[PDB]
Write a protein that binds this ligand. Structure first.
Ligand SMILES: NCCCC[C@H](N)C(=O)NS(=O)(=O)OC[C@H]1O[C@@H](n2cnc3c(N)ncnc32)[C@H](O)[C@@H]1O
Ligand SMILES: NCCCC[C@H](N)C(=O)NS(=O)(=O)OC[C@H]1O[C@@H](n2cnc3c(N)ncnc32)[C@H](O)[C@@H]1O
Lengths: 487, 486
């Protein structure tokens, strides 16, 4: 109970009162636990290297019952494990009673050890101490091997999740491996990474309620970025022809499984590229990244929870392209004539929505009805492959350049994986006269457009959702180390 | 005037009325201007390769036609330039009048060229067009180099600065190279990059905060002032070498080593102490400078490019100066502990008054000690970087107590020309000794109660390091879009 904490705390003072330092300043270890496993895993059973003295550190995770002369522990570090085998005959009795010194050790204690490497008779690789020193004590009782499935402890105290549940470490290692692979993928193709402001006087290139915060001395209100699209395109104007940013953005809406207040986005802008360049980019990149992580283009994913049978997602390129308006017009068996915000085709969409018992949009704007219609009739089209929804109407894509053969449409693409969007890209609108809100946009961006934005293609990736799919998670809370929670 | 803009706009609409697209969608180029220069730079003077046909794009930066059949242009991309030599005799009259088509071009227009490589008789590397298309017009007059030394246009329209001042490009390339070098340097050493949250409930981990309201939780959050706390929690969780490079926020005054957001890199290194962190700083700064410059000694105009430069040598080791001992030596006073006693407080206020230092208005001991070091120590060395070390425990509430000198901590701070670029220490890991767990929050404190190994942490100021390494004396010159008033 809380008695355990009280008792370990008082134990700590007792050691201080005997002039022992239960938190020493520095311990020079010679080798990591992984390095140890690598160098000594091929020893023979019962074999010892009793003249090779090592200093090693780790956390005690298992304490097995005292024999008269032998003590056994599990020691872990960097997500790996060796055994401690403390034998009375090898103990340097000059530095204290064997029994009392190893009786102090508790599960969760961090120790440093002076000893030699060797194996059990049974063959277990272990370090044989001569001396072990407490280095930092764990004052509470740690959960047991499978005792930590309570989500709240894993998110409000992720150090425990990282210590107990083997998988979580792999999940965040895989997250970093993905961001590394993305950085080096853009870097090898001549792209140039930059940092643009988190605070501005306007929210950027999407639609979302912002976070407001007050700069005091300047007595102004600033808004957290909802995207990076605008300053990065300005940098394209400045002749940084391949540019990207990997960092946080903020959107002040509701938490769910695919949506967190702050999330990690990566945007890139690519001068003289277009829609088709970006299609191939996405095919290239997801296929290579999956193959880089798994040795295959096929992975398995628990779309409907770990309680249910998973599905196979195949990242083999090319992926399918589905035209949003045409495909809605084909599934619904109706025809939507432009303008899409006609009174008549707005009412046609609203009748599709009422007839299929689909919820209707808070304001029934054409863009929001088309969005809802795609959400119900397309976005779960393919669940065994990523696919692209393409050629969105101009009324849904205020910064996408107009389609070069299909009037009213844009050269835009979104990629979906199990029906959740991971990717948003288009041929960038670069005619300042056609960006008709220059008469969530600001004059600095629009003015920059008048200096000549070359024909460019831009892409934005949801890093969190991609990580979810590649680490078999159903909630964004499992790929963010410190998800934000209600108290 | 603005008349130039109005006329360029009319020109655009007139091309559109004549069925010409002045913003085509896609131009498929064969080669970049850098690749062009690298590939044809050793052609002979006056030589041509008119049977190898290239597509290339760029920004037209010079438009000095001369002759009614020869037109000369400057073309830049990716920071490099070639000449465009448009000769009537190579023009494809089938795609439009030569003169008519080339009269349209203006300084700033982005264009695509179909042509062949060669050198002029003078030897100027050039693309020779058969066809030139407008891809995106520059509707404004571009300023020339002289025109852009106004600080405000460089900060308010950095695309201009990046187009006109080739200094600027180099600066920002250098900042990215610095961050690359740092990421690679940590990764090679076993370090694990993570992201920890930008908004927290606690004000921060190390100044006033930015407040903001989270709507879906009816809550107020604070932008992080440092990454120290969650990263130490990752050490508790067994990520024994961890780091983060991102923005932190400080709601304070704008001065040219101080911006509301700036880029920090903090790492935590389990089983390392103060000494490991000194050695790390020496290795990193020496190797980084050598990586960028092929030497350890750099020039830097501390007072601007108008005054004389000074030399900084980064060859290791750097000097270590112990703060209180040094203040005591210069002031010829003895500040004995506790440093917040009335007695020593008035010694320090007497020194401030006697030397006419401004007094820190909440005159705490920590503030005073800080003001004293800033006045007597912090610009001791300006020819070499140096460390101020062993700060009093009262200035360092998360630094582990000095293992031999009572009342001090195992902390270090590195200064270059008297501005601090990193702050590091042996970490305080005894929960009982962090005497607020009864700036900090309960989450961090409890996590200390689960066992923080002996650890050493370090924080770097990325912007300031870049300032010194790109010869700037203002932070706004190393930040692409510094915040200004409208
Ligand atoms: N120039 C073309 C588009 C540029 C990027 C543009 N700013 C944009 O599309 N942003 S976006 O639609 O928000 O897409 C960002 C991606 O990030 C992900 N995303 C978006 N909102 C969230 C939220 N709320 N949580 C998590 N992930 C999110 C998802 O993958 C999106 O496709
Ligand atoms: N456990 C060790 C401490 C970790 C780092 C500690 N959190 C810290 O010192 N944070 S910091 O004070 O913000 O310092 C980080 C560095 O950032 C730089 N810095 C600090 N404030 C600013 C401001 N405002 N602008 C620019 N650069 C700044 C300076 O180089 C500092 O040494």
């Amino acid at each position: 109970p809380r008695l355990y904490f009280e008792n370990r705390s008082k134990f700590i003072q007792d050691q201080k009162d005997k002039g022992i330092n239960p938190y020493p300043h520095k311990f020079e270890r010679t080798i990591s636990i992984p390095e140890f496993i690598e160098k000594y895993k091929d020893l023979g059973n019962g074999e010892h290297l009793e003249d090779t003295i090592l200093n090693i550190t780790g956390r005690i995770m298992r304490v097995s019952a005292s024999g008269q002369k032998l003590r056994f522990f599990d020691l872990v570090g960097d997500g790996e494990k060796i055994q401690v085998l403390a034998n009375y005959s090898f103990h340097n009795h000059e530095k204290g009673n064997f029994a009392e010194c190893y009786d102090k050790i508790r599960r969760g204690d961090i120790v440093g050890i002076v000893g030699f490497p060797g194996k059990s008779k049974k063959g277990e690789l272990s370090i044989f101490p001569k001396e072990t020193i407490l280095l930092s004590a764990c004052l509470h009782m740690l959960p047991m091997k499978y005792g930590l499935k309570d989500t709240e402890i894993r998110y409000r105290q992720r150090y425990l999740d990282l210590l107990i549940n083997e998988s979580s470490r792999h999940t965040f290692v895989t997250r970093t491996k993905i961001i590394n692979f993305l950085r080096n993928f853009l870097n090898e193709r001549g792209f140039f990474e930059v940092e643009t402001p988190m605070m501005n006087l306007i929210a950027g290139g999407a639609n979302a309620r912002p976070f407001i915060t007050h700069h005091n001395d300047l007595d102004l209100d600033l808004y957290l970025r909802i995207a990076t699209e605008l300053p990065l395109k300005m940098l394209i104007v400045g002749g940084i022809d391949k540019v990207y940013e990997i960092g946080k953005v903020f959107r002040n809406e509701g938490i769910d499984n695919t949506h967190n207040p702050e999330f990690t986005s990566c945007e890139f802008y690519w001068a003289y590229a277009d829609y088709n360049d970006l299609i191939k980019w996405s095919e290239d990149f997801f296929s290579q990244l999956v193959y880089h992580l798994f040795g295959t283009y096929k992975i398995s994913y628990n779309k409907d929870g770990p309680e249910n049978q998973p599905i196979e997602i195949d990242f083999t390129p090319p992926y399918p392209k589905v035209s949003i308006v045409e495909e809605i017009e084909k599934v619904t068996n109706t025809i939507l004539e432009q303008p899409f915000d006609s009174n008549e085709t707005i009412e046609k969409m609203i009748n599709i929505i009422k007839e299929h018992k689909i919820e209707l949009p808070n304001p029934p704007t054409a863009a929001k009805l088309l969005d809802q219609l795609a959400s119900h009739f397309i976005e779960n089209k393919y669940n065994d492959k990523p696919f692209f929804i393409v050629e969105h109407p101009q009324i849904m894509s205020p910064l996408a350049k107009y389609h070069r053969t299909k009037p009213g449409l844009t050269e835009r693409l979104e990629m979906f994986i199990c029906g959740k969007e991971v990717l948003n890209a288009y041929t960038e609108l670069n005619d300042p006269f056609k960006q008709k809100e220059c008469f969530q946009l600001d004059s600095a961006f629009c003015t920059s457009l008048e200096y000549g934005l070359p024909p460019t293609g831009g892409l934005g990736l949801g890093i969190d959702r991609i990580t979810m799919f590649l680490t078999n998670k159903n909630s964004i809370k499992d790929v963010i180390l410190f998800p934000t929670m209600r108290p």
